[PDB]
Design a protein around this ligand. Sequence first.
Ligand SMILES: CC(=O)N[C@H]1[C@H](O[C@H]2C[C@@H](C(=O)NCCS(=O)(=O)O)[NH2+][C@@H]2CO)O[C@H](CO)[C@@H](OS(=O)(=O)O)[C@@H]1O
Ligand SMILES: [Mg+2]
Ligand SMILES: [Mg+2]
Length: 576
Amino acid sequence: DLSASVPTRPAEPERKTLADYGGYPSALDAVKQKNDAAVAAYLENAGDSAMAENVRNEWLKSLGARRQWTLFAQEYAKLEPAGRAQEVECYADSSRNDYTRAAELVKNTGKLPSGCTKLLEQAAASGLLDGNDAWRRVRGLLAGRQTTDARNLAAALGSPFDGGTQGSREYALLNVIGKEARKSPNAAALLSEMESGLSLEQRSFAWGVLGHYQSQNLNVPAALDYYGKVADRRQLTDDQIEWYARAALRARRWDELASVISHMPEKLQKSPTWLYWLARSRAATGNTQEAEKLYKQAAATGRNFYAVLAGEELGRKIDTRNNVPDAGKNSVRRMAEDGAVKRALVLFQNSQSAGDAKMRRQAQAEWRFATRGFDEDKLLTAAQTAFDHGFYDMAVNSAERTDRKLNYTLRYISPFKDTVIRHAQNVNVDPAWVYGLIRQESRFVIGAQSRVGAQGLMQVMPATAREIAGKIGMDAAQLYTADGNIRMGTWYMADTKRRLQNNEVLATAGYNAGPGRARRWQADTPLEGAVYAETIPFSETRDYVKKVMANAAYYAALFGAPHIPLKQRMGIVPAR
Ligand SMILES: CC(=O)N[C@H]1[C@H](O[C@H]2C[C@@H](C(=O)NCCS(=O)(=O)O)[NH2+][C@@H]2CO)O[C@H](CO)[C@@H](OS(=O)(=O)O)[C@@H]1O
Ligand SMILES: [Mg+2]
Ligand SMILES: [Mg+2]
């Protein structure tokens, strides 16, 4: 049975929370204005809230950048360790001259926040960076168009870009690894021609750049030829080696795939993706007991695309039966009275009544703050609390964070059923697919709005709303109402599917990236759905398709629809 234990942190009146949020935006602008007196005032008797934690984190990034180390250290002490932003941790550790985190951070080859970038340059300037990892990051920044970060890290390592030693060799290599130079019809020939006087590390990385470019363009033969020249695969960035694996996957080179995965950082090897595809490689070469071991490890990763596929390879069907009772209504009422939970619900309720989308976003921040480090039982009670208050996305937020206690009704909530079901049927698309899409797009937040402007439950772009509305005789502004949004989103699902050879995997990619891009990613042979999905060049769409289809399989099992394994829902994507 679920524990009835609920936290009882001190609560504040609804008026005080509203008054503190009244000044949250000004506190944030005060940080940007470097008005330290203003920020300290806002904070000095804030609640123990996400408002205070958010303002304090942003303040500390500004104090760290401004080297106000006395004030920094006083305020860093008021952050809860779980609530420290990464860049704040970086500034703190640089102030302590502690570069233990730098050994892990330096493994990241892309853009880092300023405090984290400086932490690495400081470690570099003291001798306390792994030199192999450090120069790998330099190259990764060079390939990544982060020339200035690359330059500063080369300089911090004692070999600047203008000093005639290693750093000038690496900078010179931009004629191969540059963003536009890697596209050259001659990139490989130049690399081959200057190959003999390059180090083993510089050569492996450079061949990885050329293979990575080819692999993301879906020129699989060209990519595998270039990746096959990489002598030390540890020198590849995480993106490079994953697109090696993706090239080997798309060409069904199972032995090469398994070898590539074994050269991945152990963290990548343990991801559901490479657990599952390693298992598939093993099973396809007949190493059946090694595959069964890996499928079990993938399946244990939880409620995700590859865990389900791995389960299906083990003969395990998705089972959406809860293994835990519903939360008792009394614990749900008590939970709403915990001071941190109550603060989140106050902001949420009042965002509805006041029509304040920013206030609703802070309600989410308070919710994640209030529930951070709840045990599985409190997480499930909180989930029902959120659901009983209409806070649909935070019910999913809390319910999906458990590992052993599974409430599928709360992980895969289905509000608005009689509406979503009818609009799906009206365009003859699977309502389990539509719910899967909504869950990923908006988490059932009717006023959701992405950075690029995608709107509402189904995250329809305003541009797209204008095409849809003219075709079906709507008003394009119906985009901003729940019913109009669902009608437009469901119609666009159906329409994109029709333009993409009626394939549901293509249509999901095309919903997010546009049908023209989804069509460009098809091969000249048919592809198994999950192979098409895992080799989508846009990381946003690649992650999106897998999550939508995984949600769709859970919803279909929940609704009691005729059983469709996820592997068959992925089907076969047709050749062009
Ligand atoms: C339903 C809809 O409007 N889909 C459009 C999609 O929106 C995507 C945009 C995306 C988005 O907002 N990404 C950023 C999300 S976040 O704020 O970073 O979380 N969400 C929407 C639905 O998947 O963007 C692509 C490309 O523009 C369009 O394809 S195109 O017309 O051929 O150009 C497509 O019409
Ligand atoms: Mg989204
Ligand atoms: Mg990308």
